[PDB]
Symmetry: D3
Subunit: 231 residues, 6 copies
């Protein structure tokens, strides 16, 4: 394909999709065996290894709906990827989402226009694949990793002047990131399975920041949950 | 309250919400013990009885977003209802939705302006309360009731000359009905729990019908699942 | 049809369309002779009688644009109904609309999306059928029943957080209910005649409520006017 | 005011509003006595004369919503005009609108953003002042001038590559022109009375023309009706 | 055509398009030789003369997007006009646009719906023809006529209640008039060349008015620049 | 700042903004002397060096409006960057855009909601800083680098099932890419100067490719022009 430099076969059925190519590299080297770099196009790294003798690829997506839209589409159409699990971070916008919680996005809201372009007068609500979602839930509970399930917001603009997250906070929406809507929409469009697992980077509404050691513990929890979600 | 004739204490914490008031009476009379009809205003009946020791209210909502919104707001605001579970039907829009599958809605797309009216340039995806959803999932699996989880479309025009269900089918959307988005949006706004459980009434894009026997079977399943959410 | 349980012929040319099925029953029993219930589907009652030896049906519509849209469509497509007269109540939003006035809606505004779904960049303005409107006007004046003619608003949400009725009040709009737009739009679409006759339930903008005896006198006036509108 | 060169008292309570300033002079000179041209700014002429004892002003508005809006705002705000009656033409979009029918607009649909700019997610249906409308109806019937009442479409692009008049015809809409929604929306905002009276210039969807004799006849009818509203 | 009363040939390749028909007449009589009126339809005058022995027409457009849209379309489709240069005035909305500056509109913003009707979910940005724009720039600098290049706003409503020019002022937008968007969009649509040259009528945001003698000097500068823009 | 690891003073007044960070390193290493990589956060590299006595920073932005917006906001807000010039490629959508033509964007249309989110019912046309544009034009003409000036389309879906480039081609639009509107809108908001210079990567509506030799040639041209804006 155009944005991915793999050959036939270099990419597994199941892909983790972190935002940051350097987290992709870090995840591949830390949790996966017999690792290969199959893509260095644009510095957006893709690696394939094995976890408990199952093939698993890890492809950085970049930030924003357009970036992930390109890689999801090309992972699906050109490499027949079946399961797409995003593993990133979001900004918590409610007091009750706690800094160690691992979030499983059931659906996403958005101020992207990608779906108004498609459906016009329809509000399209992207849906996670429940099968994936459920395995991710049970893998969390099993170990007793704390976990929260609900909706997120897919922002188009990180530094938003007209930010309505204060309203979305009052409808139960959990946090803001910039990718989920695009993942779920394209996955669904193509008959593939998708889920987003998010850790809390900060609390947006009180400025309050997570420490580097909490972030590091929840990240581990996230990747680990993810790794037992398929089947 | 303006559309519900009940006093304090007549309405349960937990309320089932069929569209049809005669299905509400049906549910109340068949499955609940010690039943009182608490509302006859507009012939939109509501009943309260008990099921395994626990008060369960059953309330007709009528058809469409505006209608269910009036009832859900009043149930929430005037009667401090905590759990709101819609039990109804929907037109299957995909072949892999089979006539017997009980659907649980994670979320719902809509052509309703209700949320654009609230949010401007945000698409608000309404969300089911996951605990209720999991409980309903668990209860279906525990009995072996066939169950599919995913999304519906909450339509405003049952008869839609510019229907976009042909495209919504291509994005995974399971079926079409007329209330869910209202219920899920208003429940969350007021910090209450909501879930929609739905049986198939027809296959819309093959026009094809489900028999009265299939519907009776699937409607029972749907009640028995609900009663354990 | 699907939502109406009549046979061929049980429904007249002319239908009154009140919101409340129990007002449908009350109207049928009070003003009409030789009454039959032809529909009990969903508790949404339809009756047919005769008034001064002319056939007239009365079908509850339910509340909101979707509910009425279903019954209007099925009254038109499956029973070839020619005249559709809605007879309900609205909330008065201007001081100069008085509690005894019977309102004849010439057009309606709306925050329903039913017409943006249809026309997109077009603002569609539903229009009453003037012939009906005029007969309704002359039947009012004739008796000296007080009557006001103008536009209404068809709300989607009864308990609206973002309510703009304060602005619509400054453009001359008379009151808010939840059905007119849908009636006029579908009627027009199918080449049928439509009109909405409304009584004032309350004044929305000062909380001020009508008494049960005023409501009862204007309701009579409304139905009576309606009953002499066709031809 | 910025676009009208008149002093206090030169402009009537009642003002006719043709699109074309040469039709304004035509109306003023043919039907009114004791006529003064009160405005020549931008060659958009306005005249005042008398008809049966009563001052009648006649003012060109130009073409389009933006144009008529400037004039109508200024007539209202600077000159306390009470009655504003547009007299013009429109393209018939339906077969049952005949070339001789004088149209009175109850309301108007539009592709103009003017009202969405004011109201967000509301469709504002502009409304005619019913008294003026009834008076014009009565005057047409009293003489036997053929008259049709219903809705028009106020377009922004006379030449519209994405024209939706084919669909608006299916919803009853009688004809297409370019001002009415502006007039009806601004009149009501400021608590004044407005009405549009319109003759047919062509049948747009059969392309077909009306003869110069038909138009002259229908234009006279239209004036004589107006002069009694 | 319908709104223009010329014959074959009466209109030149290049047209000046002022808002005011009486400015069209004034421009024709003051700067052009061997003048003919070729259109008096609607009092919207069109004249053709010669400037330094080149043919040039001057056609009043009227005010607002619809008015100019009609004449541009008919100048293009029925008279094969190649270059369309608008020569009007705008309201300056930033302090740094000065009362003698001649503005060359590179692009326009708008609250007209003409382009949302066409493209829907697309924001269409009309573009000036650079060739014209560049000649107009060089003709200004050459003489040392002071000149500013940027974007304008094409208002639909002169007396706007919900006016957002305070926001457009913060994005660098220079001034407001009511025609440019329509000109550039139709010109572009048909493969023709277009540019808008504007003088400052007032400063909108401080009420501050230009004097009748400044207006008269910049108007001269505008027409003169325009007259050396083609080729 | 959150996405750029630079200290005070490491970033130039003037910053080139290719989409691809490996093209950023390429630009920095080939054309600049005395080069330091000031950022490796997210592997979105930024370099600073000198070109004819003058600091020039080169910064990867990634793909899409959201991505370039983060970088441009931070470059502006945290590093007081004055000149922001995007150097990249775009799919030619018209036949009269030839493979060698260097495009300068006057403006950009978009399907991005970013500006509707800011402005409601206004279409905001983002504008290039004309001085930068003229300077780039002049530098292209001074060398005889083929140059076309006009508009692009800033897309959000590279793969767009409901693509409207077939219509945008008919209105003059030269090519399609994914950043420009963000850059031009954010630069102007904060009173800084911006310009987009773009080479052709393919002809989208004839599907047809440009050879690796053509792209290398046009990419060099594009850099050499930029370096004199
Ligand atoms: N508070 C936050 N707000 C937004 F809009 N995005 C956040 C936030 N925290 C983390 N992210 C994730 O990190 C990247 C942006 O830095 C994006 O890739 C995004 O997914
Ligand atoms: N095929 C169907 N399409 C739509 F739009 N709604 C359906 C369908 N089947 C059942 N329903 C549900 O029943 C009521 C409609 O009679 C509505 O309340 C709706 O919820
Ligand atoms: N103040 C009011 N506001 C709204 F939105 N609707 C009103 C009001 N008063 C009466 N109605 C009519 O009564 C029913 C809703 O109770 C609906 O059927 C509606 O037609
Ligand atoms: N067929 C027609 N279509 C449209 F859109 N407008 C029409 C038509 N006929 C007459 N008009 C009226 O006359 C002027 C247009 O020349 C406009 O002012 C308009 O009001
Ligand atoms: N301040 C201003 N605001 C707006 F909206 N338009 C202005 C302004 N100044 C001059 N114009 C130009 O003059 C005419 C309107 O009087 C229109 O033709 C328009 O082009
Ligand atoms: N044909 C093309 N279509 C679109 F939408 N974008 C294009 C194209 N060619 C190059 N680009 C630019 O390169 C990146 C996409 O790989 C994006 O950053 C984009 O700017």
């Amino acid at each position: 394909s155009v944005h991915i430099g793999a050959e036939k076969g270099q990419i597994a059925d199941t892909v983790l999709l972190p935002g940051d190519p350097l987290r992709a590299k870090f995840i591949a080297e830390t949790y996966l065996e017999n690792v290969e770099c199959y893509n260095e196009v644009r510095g957006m790294y893709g690696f394939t290894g094995t976890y408990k003798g199952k093939k698993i690829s890890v492809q950085g997506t970049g930030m924003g709906v357009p970036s992930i839209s390109i890689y999801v589409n090309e992972l699906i159409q050109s490499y027949d990827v079946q399961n797409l699990i995003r593993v990133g971070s979001c900004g918590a916008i409610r007091k009750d989402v706690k800094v160690r919680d691992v979030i499983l996005a059931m659906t996403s809201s958005t101020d992207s226009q990608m779906n108004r372009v498609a459906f016009g007068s329809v509000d399209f609500a992207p849906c996670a694949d429940f099968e994936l979602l459920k395995n991710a839930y049970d893998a969390a509970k099993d170990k007793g990793v704390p976990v929260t399930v609900g909706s997120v917001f897919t922002a188009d603009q990180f530094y938003n002047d007209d930010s309505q997250i204060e309203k979305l906070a009052k409808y139960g929406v959990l946090g803001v990131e910039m990718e989920t809507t695009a993942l779920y929409t394209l996955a669904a469009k193509h008959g593939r399975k998708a889920l987003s697992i998010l850790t809390v980077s900060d609390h947006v509404l009180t400025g309050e920041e997570t420490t580097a050691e909490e972030r590091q513990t929840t990240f581990h929890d996230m990747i680990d949950v993810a790794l037992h979600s398929v089947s």
